[PDB]
């Protein structure tokens, strides 16, 4: 993956350059990359490793953890409310932009695999699109949309020869 190479190259500089206490801007890159891969276990443990003196001095790290708090609870309407509140203009902006696309893609693979008759009033709060825009994009894909009820219905030879001589002799 393209975003998986940025996480491997960031952890190598964390255990080599600093001798004890790292830097705030590096902690914001590891926490933002863990939120994109939908890995709440490594993101929660990384937040506890940061000393309390860094969180109280750097206010940019508090906004990143606020978005990850709703991911552990898995609340779709609670993701877009925390993104447009605290942002950093450095190295987190190009990473936070990809996090909003992963939220809409996560609801697309979850509703179409668990909600065979989702309500149109509740489907708008899962992808971020309004009610007037959620019922339009589903018709161009292939999903039906009922009326007067607001209901949406989504959804070799080289290996074989080696085992012959190995088992015989």
């Amino acid at each position: 993956f393209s975003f998986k190479k940025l996480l491997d190259q960031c952890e190598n500089q964390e255990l080599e350059a600093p001798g004890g206490i790292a830097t705030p801007p590096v902690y914001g890159q590891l926490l933002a990359l863990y939120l994109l891969h939908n890995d709440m276990n490594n993101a929660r443990y990384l937040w506890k490793r940061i000393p309390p003196a860094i969180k109280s001095a750097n206010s940019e790290l508090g906004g990143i953890w606020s978005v990850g708090q709703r991911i552990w609870q898995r609340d779709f309407p609670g993701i877009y409310t925390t993104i447009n509140a605290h942002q950093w203009s450095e190295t987190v902006q190009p990473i936070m932009e990809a996090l909003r696309d992963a939220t809409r893609r996560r609801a697309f693979a979850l509703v179409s695999q668990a909600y065979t008759s989702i309500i149109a009033d509740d489907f708008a709060a899962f992808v971020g699109l309004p009610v007037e825009e959620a019922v339009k994009g589903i018709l161009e894909q292939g999903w039906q949309a009922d009326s007067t009820t607001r209901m949406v219905l989504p959804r070799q030879l080289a290996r074989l020869t080696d085992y012959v001589a190995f088992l015989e002799n």
């Binding site: 952890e11 964390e14 001798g19 004890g20 443990y45 000393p51 996560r106 668990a114 209901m151």
Partner: protein, 403 residues
Amino acid sequence: MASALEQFVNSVRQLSAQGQMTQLCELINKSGELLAKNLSHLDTVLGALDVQEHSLGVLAVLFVKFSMPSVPDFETLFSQVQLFISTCNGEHIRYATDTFAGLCHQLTNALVERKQPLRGIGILKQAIDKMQMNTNQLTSIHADLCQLCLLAKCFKPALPYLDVDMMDICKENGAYDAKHFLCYYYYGGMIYTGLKNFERALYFYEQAITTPAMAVSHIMLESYKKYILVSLILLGKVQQLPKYTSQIVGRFIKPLSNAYHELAQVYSTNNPSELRNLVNKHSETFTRDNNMGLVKQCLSSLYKKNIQRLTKTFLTLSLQDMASRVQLSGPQEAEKYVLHMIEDGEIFASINQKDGMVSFHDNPEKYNNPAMLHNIDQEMLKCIELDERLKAMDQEITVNPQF
């Protein structure tokens, strides 16, 4: 006549050029019975590769004091040991395993009391690659690497060193102990537990229990207490112990772990009302044995087990009837709990909001995809290699005389 610091720097070159390399580990451990730092300044202008092998002995001596020499400037000692592992590396590290392993142990002890032990992870991750010949070996250095991941909550470097099974430890002059074999399997089981890898956590915790002993210990007590909580999440009963297990676990650890044995009895009945009463009752035992957090996963596992149990019996249960057996207080809480299992992949279901019910279907996978055949061929490549390694060890025993 002459300084004593000059006669102790040229003696490391005679043992490194001869066939006898055992005396080299003893000369660098004492450093001429001196407790100074003048030997590190003489290995630069008279060093073969970079700092030879006498550089690790001087730094390991200063780590025994567990203090700083003068002024808060202890960063000059952590950076000196990093250049020897990366740049200098070392060629005689296979014979001097006593001083090479003890250097990483004394470095981690002096990194926790001062600042945060973060630099020690990147240093120990490079020395473990030199002792492994691309076959995943085990040693005393690998056992100390798992302890660094427990303090510094970061399981990223512990993935390439634990995803592949290890065998045949690196031995040449003595570098392992019985305490390192029990502390490695105990620390490794905690990584697979939080990583939602119960398939590997059950095997790691089973090796620390089957090891025989003579009495009781803190490692063996915490290994059996965690073996019940792990097996209670996957299945509904604790797995039995092998025949070669220790008799202390079934005579001393079993009666002492009465708070964990009664937990598996109520789990078989599948009752959330009776399981909540055992948490507040055994709260004093879970706090004195630092087992907080492990028992919280068993509370949510009972609710997930009742949903999977209804899949075999029922098919399309109503949303209101599902809140009585599982006990979720209202049908609104039932639609939120079943959505968590879809994202994790524990079960596949579909919510029918048009009729107020929920469907429970199986997995429509016949395992006919071409990707499944590649998984069998890749798994068979490790079976033919394990048998070839056992043939070399079997011929070695036949050469030596036996009874």
